[PDB]
Homo-oligomer: A and B are copies of this chain.
Amino acid sequence: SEACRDGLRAVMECRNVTHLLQQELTEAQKGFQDVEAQAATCNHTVMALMASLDAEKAQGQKKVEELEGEITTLNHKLQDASAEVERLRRENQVLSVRIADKKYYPSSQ
Protein backbone atom coordinates (compact mmCIF):
# COMPACT_ATOMS: atom_id res chain seq x y z
CA SER A 1 0.00 0.00 0.00
CA GLU A 2 2.46 2.68 1.25
CA ALA A 3 5.40 0.24 1.31
CA CYS A 4 4.46 -0.76 -2.25
CA ARG A 5 4.67 2.86 -3.50
CA ASP A 6 8.15 3.07 -1.97
CA GLY A 7 9.31 -0.23 -3.44
CA LEU A 8 8.19 0.90 -6.89
CA ARG A 9 10.24 4.07 -6.26
CA ALA A 10 13.33 2.04 -5.35
CA VAL A 11 12.97 -0.10 -8.47
CA MET A 12 12.25 2.95 -10.63
CA GLU A 13 15.49 4.57 -9.45
CA CYS A 14 17.47 1.41 -10.22
CA ARG A 15 15.86 1.19 -13.65
CA ASN A 16 17.22 4.62 -14.64
CA VAL A 17 20.59 4.24 -12.85
CA THR A 18 21.39 1.10 -14.88
CA HIS A 19 20.64 3.16 -18.01
CA LEU A 20 23.37 5.55 -16.83
CA LEU A 21 25.62 2.59 -16.06
CA GLN A 22 25.19 1.31 -19.61
CA GLN A 23 26.17 4.77 -20.99
CA GLU A 24 29.25 4.99 -18.73
CA LEU A 25 30.34 1.49 -19.76
CA THR A 26 30.39 2.56 -23.39
CA GLU A 27 32.65 5.49 -22.58
CA ALA A 28 34.93 3.06 -20.69
CA GLN A 29 34.82 0.67 -23.67
CA LYS A 30 35.74 3.46 -26.11
CA GLY A 31 38.47 4.47 -23.65
CA PHE A 32 40.14 1.05 -23.67
CA GLN A 33 39.91 0.97 -27.47
CA ASP A 34 41.55 4.33 -27.77
CA VAL A 35 44.19 3.47 -25.08
CA GLU A 36 44.60 0.30 -27.19
CA ALA A 37 44.95 2.48 -30.29
CA GLN A 38 47.33 5.00 -28.69
CA ALA A 39 49.51 2.09 -27.49
CA ALA A 40 49.74 0.54 -30.99
CA THR A 41 50.74 3.95 -32.38
CA CYS A 42 53.49 4.46 -29.76
CA ASN A 43 54.66 0.90 -30.29
CA HIS A 44 55.06 1.43 -34.04
CA THR A 45 56.88 4.72 -33.48
CA VAL A 46 59.45 2.95 -31.29
CA MET A 47 59.87 0.44 -34.16
CA ALA A 48 60.29 3.33 -36.65
CA LEU A 49 62.89 5.08 -34.49
CA MET A 50 64.96 2.02 -33.61
CA ALA A 51 65.06 1.42 -37.39
CA SER A 52 66.26 4.98 -38.07
CA LEU A 53 68.85 4.83 -35.32
CA ASP A 54 70.33 1.71 -36.88
CA ALA A 55 70.06 3.27 -40.35
CA GLU A 56 71.91 6.35 -39.14
CA LYS A 57 74.70 4.45 -37.38
CA ALA A 58 75.06 2.25 -40.46
CA GLN A 59 75.34 5.20 -42.86
CA GLY A 60 77.44 6.99 -40.27
CA GLN A 61 80.08 4.30 -39.91
CA LYS A 62 79.89 4.23 -43.73
CA LYS A 63 80.81 7.90 -44.27
CA VAL A 64 83.65 7.63 -41.75
CA GLU A 65 84.81 4.38 -43.34
CA GLU A 66 84.70 6.25 -46.70
CA LEU A 67 86.93 9.06 -45.46
CA GLU A 68 89.58 6.94 -43.77
CA GLY A 69 89.64 5.19 -47.13
CA GLU A 70 90.62 8.51 -48.69
CA ILE A 71 93.04 9.47 -45.94
CA THR A 72 95.06 6.31 -46.32
CA THR A 73 95.06 6.76 -50.10
CA LEU A 74 96.44 10.24 -49.56
CA ASN A 75 99.05 8.96 -47.15
CA HIS A 76 100.10 6.53 -49.86
CA LYS A 77 100.32 9.17 -52.58
CA LEU A 78 102.25 11.31 -50.12
CA GLN A 79 104.63 8.45 -49.56
CA ASP A 80 105.51 8.16 -53.26
CA ALA A 81 105.97 11.86 -53.76
CA SER A 82 108.02 12.20 -50.60
CA ALA A 83 110.27 9.34 -51.73
CA GLU A 84 110.57 10.68 -55.28
CA VAL A 85 111.66 14.08 -53.89
CA GLU A 86 114.37 12.48 -51.77
CA ARG A 87 115.82 10.48 -54.58
CA LEU A 88 115.88 13.45 -56.99
CA ARG A 89 117.56 15.82 -54.54
CA ARG A 90 120.34 13.32 -54.07
CA GLU A 91 120.69 12.60 -57.80
CA ASN A 92 120.67 16.37 -58.41
CA GLN A 93 123.33 16.82 -55.74
CA VAL A 94 125.60 14.27 -57.37
CA LEU A 95 125.24 15.98 -60.77
CA SER A 96 125.95 19.39 -59.29
CA VAL A 97 129.12 18.24 -57.48
CA ARG A 98 130.30 16.31 -60.54
CA ILE A 99 130.05 19.60 -62.46
CA ALA A 100 131.88 21.47 -59.65
CA ASP A 101 134.74 18.93 -59.78
CA LYS A 102 136.03 19.84 -63.28
CA LYS A 103 138.40 16.78 -62.97
CA TYR A 104 135.36 15.66 -64.93
CA TYR A 105 136.41 18.51 -67.34
CA PRO A 106 139.49 18.83 -69.59
CA SER A 107 142.17 21.33 -68.60
CA SER A 108 142.05 24.60 -70.70
CA GLN A 109 145.84 25.18 -70.72
Q: What is the interface of chain A, defined by CB distance below 8 A to chain B?
A: 7, 11, 14, 21, 26, 28, 30-35, 37-57, 59-61, 63-64, 67-68, 70-71, 74-75, 77-85, 87-89, 91-92, 94-96, 98-100, 102-109
Contact = CB atoms under 8 A, between A and B. Distances in A.
Contact of A99 (B35, B81, B99): B99
A29 to B, nearest CB: 8
B92 A45 contact: no
The main secondary structure of chain A at its interface with chain B is: helix
A63 B62 CA distance: 12
Contacts of A59: 60, 106-109
A91 to B, nearest CB: 5
A19 to B, nearest CB: 11
A32 B30 CA distance: 12
A37 B91 contact: yes
Interface centre among A28, A35, A43, A103 (most CB of B within 10 A): A103
Contact of A50 (B37, B38, B88, B103): B103
